[PDB]
Specification:
The structure is cut from a larger assembly and holds 1 copy of chain A, 2 copies of chain B and 1 copy of chain D. By secondary structure, chain A is mainly β. In chain A, the strands form 4 sheets. In chain A, strands 2, 4, 5, 6, 9, 10 and 11 form a 7-stranded mixed β-sheet that branches. Chain A is elongated. Chain B is an alpha+beta fold. Chain B is 12% helix and 14% strand. In chain B, strands 1-2 form a two-stranded antiparallel sheet. In chain B, a hairpin with a 4-residue loop joins strand 1 and strand 2. The termini of chain B are far apart. Chain D is 0% helix and 48% strand. In chain D, the strands form 4 sheets. In chain D, strands 2, 4, 5, 6, 9, 10 and 11 form a 7-stranded mixed β-sheet that branches. In chain D, strand 4 and strand 5 form a beta hairpin. The radius of gyration of chain D is 22 Å and the shape is elongated. Classes of the chains: A mainly beta, B alpha+beta, D mainly beta. Chains A and D meet through strand 5, strand 10, strand 12, strand 13 and strand 16 of A and strand 5, strand 10, strand 12, strand 13 and strand 17 of D. The complex binds a molecule of 3 linked components (NAG-NAG-MAN). A molecule of 3 linked components (NAG-NAG-MAN) binds next to loops of chain C.
Chain lengths: 215, 56, 56, 221
């Protein structure tokens, strides 16, 4: 087996700059005078895509991708970095079965710090007739990735019943989004009033959105 | 002409290049002329090149 | 192939800081895509009736 | 074109067997070796095997030699893979891929047949509209929603106005809640358009033959 090790594991690069992802082969992948390395691009949520064959030549692939290297170590250079470049990049060798891939490198775009467009939602009436309560709270289109949702029921905090879900960095605007559902039973629910959703970002030095049970 | 034979057929033709616009008129009434030949493979349109050349 | 008209195609190599100028008022079959000669090397056009074998 | 149409997402009881298919189209089936790739959910690509249609020769990975079986239907212009006696391990996505020429690159990758191995029963979802608070309005633009809760197995498709709205839309990834999936969608239209504009949420869950529509009615207050 020719163990392929990519570095670094995750790379965050500013828009319009240079991404430089490396590959390192345990033994050479390089005879007949050519390198049998290949780079692959997996844009989130879809199958991988072929970028470079035999380590240097582009497959309908923009010139921004520089395939380089020889022998034991190579490098995919993306420069200039564009918006639609969020993906995980893979190098795979064909020099010798069994075909082996790299760990893969995930690329993230650094953009303008955007603020979370919070919005809180009461549980459906149809759901409540079924017996359960679900307080949903979206936190769309923001950057950096890190965010911190807090739930408060009548001033007192709560973690149990919470389910969070982030989307991948959007290929088009480079902004994350987040769901944050809070599930309870009708009776557990009807024993309180105010439901809050305190998001603490680096953008605002807490963003809040809440609603009261009886209106 | 449609070659109905079973063989390739060698066909020859020609164009006349006169001395002056006068000779042109005397022989073929029309002043500007062409010859177009068409085949599955052949496509040409010849235009006579009037000039004064030495007598041969 | 049903058609009795003909199309005649041409090519040229456009050197790296040179430009190609088309001017036409009809019958023009225009380029949309051209080909960058990325790798020149020693190769060949082999006339054969066979197809790939997945071997080396 | 070089399209590779493959089988639809599948669910298998642990210990059973699957047979996902990949239908070739647009090139000569018999000129290229077809291969299969397994991707452990958002992790790493693994090579399974290869088969050359024209004579049916197979080439396997050590790892999959046993559990896998590539076969080819020449008249059908179709490649098949079969996974026998599955485990949680095999729950991942499988790509039917055309490799160009032992020393070759995979140039045309198929969609991906995604396999889910669980003893769990098939469960239709429940869809709930998300109208904003009766006394609060986000300024120039109004965010609207749709909630899909309690279904199995993946996946589901969420559309807005049968698909004609494709702009401000975010469909978030599903999550596991009491051993069922749950996800949400967020359409964002200009404040003037709603509630004047018909905003309908169109959700589909193939696994249960379910197609549901929910219209976002403003807060009755
Ligand atoms: C095809 O495009 C080319 C680039 O737009 C063009 O070349 C340009 O030619 C100009 C003069 O016409 C050069 O002007 C100056 O060049 C350098 C500065 O780097 C100095 O020696 C002088 O100050 C000089 O005046 C441009 O630099 C040059 N640009 C590039 C990028 O090479 C071609 O001439 C165009 N060709 C045709 C056939 O139209």
């Amino acid at each position: 087996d020719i163990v392929l090790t990519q570095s670094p594991g995750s790379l965050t690069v500013s828009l319009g700059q240079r991404a430089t992802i490396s590959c390192r082969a345990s033994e050479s992948v390089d005879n007949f005078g050519k390198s049998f390395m290949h780079w692959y691009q997996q844009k989130p949520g879809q199958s991988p895509k072929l970028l470079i064959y035999r380590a240097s030549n582009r497959e309908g692939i923009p010139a921004r991708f520089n395939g380089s290297g020889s022998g034991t170590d190579f490098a995919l250079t993306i420069n200039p970095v564009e918006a639609d470049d969020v993906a995980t990049y893979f190098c795979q060798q064909s020099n010798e079965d069994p075909r082996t891939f790299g760990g893969g490198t995930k690329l993230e775009i650094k953009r303008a710090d955007a603020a979370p467009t919070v919005s809180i939602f009461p549980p459906s009436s149809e759901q409540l007739t079924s017996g359960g309560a679900s307080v949903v709270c979206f936190l769309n289109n923001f950057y950096p990735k890190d965010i911190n949702v807090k739930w408060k029921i009548d001033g007192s905090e709560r973690q149990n019943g919470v389910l969070n879900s982030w989307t991948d960095q959007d290929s088009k605007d480079s902004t994350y989004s987040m769901s944050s559902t809070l599930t309870l039973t009708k009776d557990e629910y009807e024993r309180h009033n105010s439901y809050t959703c305190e998001a603490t970002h680096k953008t605002s030095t807490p963003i809040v959105k809440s609603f009261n049970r009886n209106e | 002409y449609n070659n109905t034979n079973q063989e390739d057929l060698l066909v020859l033709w020609g164009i006349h290049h006169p001395n002056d616009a006068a000779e042109q008129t005397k022989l073929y009434q029309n002043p500007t002329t062409y010859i177009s030949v068409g085949t599955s493979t052949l496509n040409q349109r010849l235009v006579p090149e009037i000039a004064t050349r030495p007598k041969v | 192939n049903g058609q009795s008209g003909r199309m005649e195609f041409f090519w040229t190599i456009l050197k790296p800081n040179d430009a190609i100028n088309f001017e036409s008022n009809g019958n023009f079959i225009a380029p949309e895509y051209a080909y960058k000669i990325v790798k020149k090397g020693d190769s060949a056009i082999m006339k054969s009736e066979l197809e790939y074998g997945n071997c080396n | 074109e070089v399209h590779l149409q493959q089988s639809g997402p599948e669910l298998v009881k642990p210990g059973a067997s699957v047979k996902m298919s990949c239908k070739t189209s647009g090139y000569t089936f018999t000129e290229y070796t077809i291969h299969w790739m397994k991707q452990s959910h958002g992790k790493s690509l693994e090579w399974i095997g290869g088969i050359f249609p024209n004579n049916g020769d197979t080439t396997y990975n050590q790892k999959f030699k046993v559990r896998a079986t590539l076969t080819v239907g020449r008249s059908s212009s179709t490649a098949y893979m079969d996974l026998r006696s599955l485990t949680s391990e095999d729950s991942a996505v499988y790509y039917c891929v055309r490799n160009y020429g032992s020393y070759g690159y995979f140039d045309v990758w198929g969609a991906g047949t995604t396999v889910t191995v669980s003893s769990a029963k098939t469960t239709p979802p429940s869809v709930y509209p998300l109208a904003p608070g009766s006394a609060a309005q986000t300024n120039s633009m109004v965010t609207l929603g749709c909630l899909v809760k309690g279904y199995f197995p993946e996946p589901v498709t969420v559309t807005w106005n049968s698909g004609s709205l494709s702009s401000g839309v975010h469909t978030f990834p599903a999550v596991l809640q009491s051993d069922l999936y749950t996800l949400s969608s967020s359409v964002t239209v200009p404040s003037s358009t709603w509630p004047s504009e018909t905003v309908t949420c169109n959700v589909a869950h193939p696994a249960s033959s379910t197609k549901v529509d929910k219209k976002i009615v403003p807060r009755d207050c």
